[PDB]
Ligand binder design. Structure first.
Ligand SMILES: *[C@@H](O)[C@H](C[C@@H]1CCNC1=O)NC(=O)[C@H](CC(C)C)NC(=O)OC[C@@H]1CCC(=O)N1Cc1cccc(F)c1
Ligand SMILES: *[C@H](O)[C@H](C[C@@H]1CCNC1=O)NC(=O)[C@H](CC(C)C)NC(=O)OC[C@@H]1CCC(=O)N1Cc1cccc(F)c1
Lengths: 301, 298
């Protein structure tokens, strides 16, 4: 197809990874300026995890109970607090590798790079999409909690995800860097179900725009639709309804190709109602939904 | 189960910009030497049949502009090794990692750090195709981007980017400047040899699908190695060697599936197809995961 999942270069995030240990429980933390951010369940013993009282568990903790290390080098903790589901450990050293950064809460459909880490050491980097049911399909093993997801704009790192858990179906759930979970999930080791997932319509449209940019445009038609009519049809095919923000982020591709967003929606609606009929788009009989409009522009330009 | 690249920070710290005339690409700065594609010294009239030894002797150290960020590095020496230019600079890169230069075999995988104007832009996994192309994502100005693997803390550089072919695939050299494949750094339309599929990798990926619960493609049948290889070659799959079977052992033990039993499944898939079904999300058989890749992630 000419498109692959491309991650952002991970070096600016690698320089922020540390490990945080309580007792024998080690996960990863994010060291920015003089604060280390990590999942609050580092303070939980295995038996605390079905039903933890995080407030009670935290009042029993002192600064000197937290082992924060950059490599083998201990960073002394001088304060601690909880914000939603993340712990903030104030340390006595400002990280000299701190990048320009922002904490952003992304929307379903958006993609981000994950730097998978174990014991504070990066293992690998890969691109993830936030599914509409607020799960991601990561590759996360024991010890991966506290690994983060990010995008990089003009040397600014926008951190959007911190890893906390795996669901029964093998997908993954976590928080933003203010500790608010994506989705309805909670950091207790109880049985939780992801909602039935749906197809990320805005990304399929981006993919159709990408096909057009590359000269593959058999599926364009002379018709249009309203956004409401399209959304009611799309839901019958387990496609996500479009938001105004979706229409907005398709703006640049619409301008580049001269195909109005709602006209492309009409082409998609026909593909959904009539199927592909043996045809392919960018080489594939199936529509890709894990490339955002930004991803497409990044790879075509 | 995802394509996972190595963390790229050790390589980012080595990328610089190199300019000659109106041509700008990336270089790799290790200790006091910058490595880059020699075609940076070519113009237009040069592009179609460049006598590089002739073009290089007419250059002076000061014709080369090397920038690490916004600081210029002064070129105090230059030489050519095959298709790579080596620019000696007066400053050592303190961010130089432990490293080696390796030439990889077809079927092996590596991470690419795509860069433009000396700035890292993206990271992704590639495999060296059997026909010695790579299916990369490279635009204008990506030349000198490198591919690499990491072992312990040692960076093994295996690829430097030079060109795109009309089919959209990519070609380049090792860090000694020798091309992978029958390609030449001249501005001419070049075709690759017929590509084949990397059989040991498809098998690794089927084992990964099993580990993660996909089993619809397994079967009771068995096959000999020779008979599997007859069917493989018929479908332009690479031969599977006994070293390949040996390499797949760990994955076989973990899943309880004999290598030749998974060969029997793959034979069935090649002869029948996937019948609409998908494996790990794909309608196609994936061949850019090595056995090591699957393990290092499972
Ligand atoms: C880096 O300098 C640049 C990287 C290219 C640009 C687009 N995508 C890339 O990966 N490489 C080049 O400028 C080379 C320089 C020569 C001196 C090797 N040229 C190049 O890549 O384009 C010409 C190539 C050379 C092999 C080939 O077949 N060919 C012609 C061609 C035909 C159709 C489409 C196409 F992209 C190239
Ligand atoms: C943190 O490193 C770790 C990351 C896990 C380990 C394996 N893959 C991951 O993503 N997270 C945990 O161990 C969490 C911690 C609690 C305090 C949230 N626990 C966890 O993932 O437990 C299993 C999850 C908890 C919610 C749930 O429904 N559930 C059941 C489950 C699902 C799949 C597999 C499994 F063993 C249990």
């Amino acid at each position: 197809s000419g498109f692959r999942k491309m991650a952002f270069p991970s070096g600016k995030v690698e320089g922020c990874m540390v490990q945080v240990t309580c007792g024998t429980t080690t996960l990863n933390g994010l060291w920015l300026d003089d604060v280390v951010y990590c999942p609050r369940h580092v303070i939980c013993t295995s038996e605390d995890m079905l039903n933890p009282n995080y407030e009670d568990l935290l009042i029993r903790k002192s600064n000197h109970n937290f082992l924060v290390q950059a490599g083998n080098v201990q960073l002394r903790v001088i304060g601690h607090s909880m914000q939603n589901c993340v712990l903030k450990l104030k340390v006595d050293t400002a990280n000299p590798k701190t990048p320009k950064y922002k904490f952003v809460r992304i929307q379903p459909g958006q993609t981000f790079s994950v730097l998978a880490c174990y014991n504070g050491s990066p293992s690998g980097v890969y691109q993830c999409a936030m599914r509409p049911n607020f799960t991601i399909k990561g590759s996360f093993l024991n010890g991966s909690c506290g690994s983060v997801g990010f995008n990089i704009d003009y040397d600014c790192v926008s951190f959007c995800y911190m890893h906390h858990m795996e669901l029964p179906t093998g997908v993954h759930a976590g928080t933003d860097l203010e500790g608010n979970f994506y989705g309805p999930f909670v950091d207790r080791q109880t049985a939780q179900a992801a909602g039935t997932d749906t197809t990320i319509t805005v990304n399929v449209l981006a993919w159709l725009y990408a096909a057009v940019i590359n000269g593959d445009r058999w599926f364009l038609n002379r018709f249009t639709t309203t956004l409401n009519d399209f959304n009611l049809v799309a839901m019958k095919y387990n496609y996500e309804p479009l938001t105004q923000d979706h229409v907005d982020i398709l703006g640049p591709l619409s301008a580049q190709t001269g195909i109005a967003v709602l006209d492309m929606c009409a082409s998609l609606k026909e593909l959904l109602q009539n199927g592909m009929n043996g045809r392919t788009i960018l080489g594939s009989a199936l529509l890709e939904d894990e490339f955002t409009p930004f991803d497409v522009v990044r790879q075509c330009s």
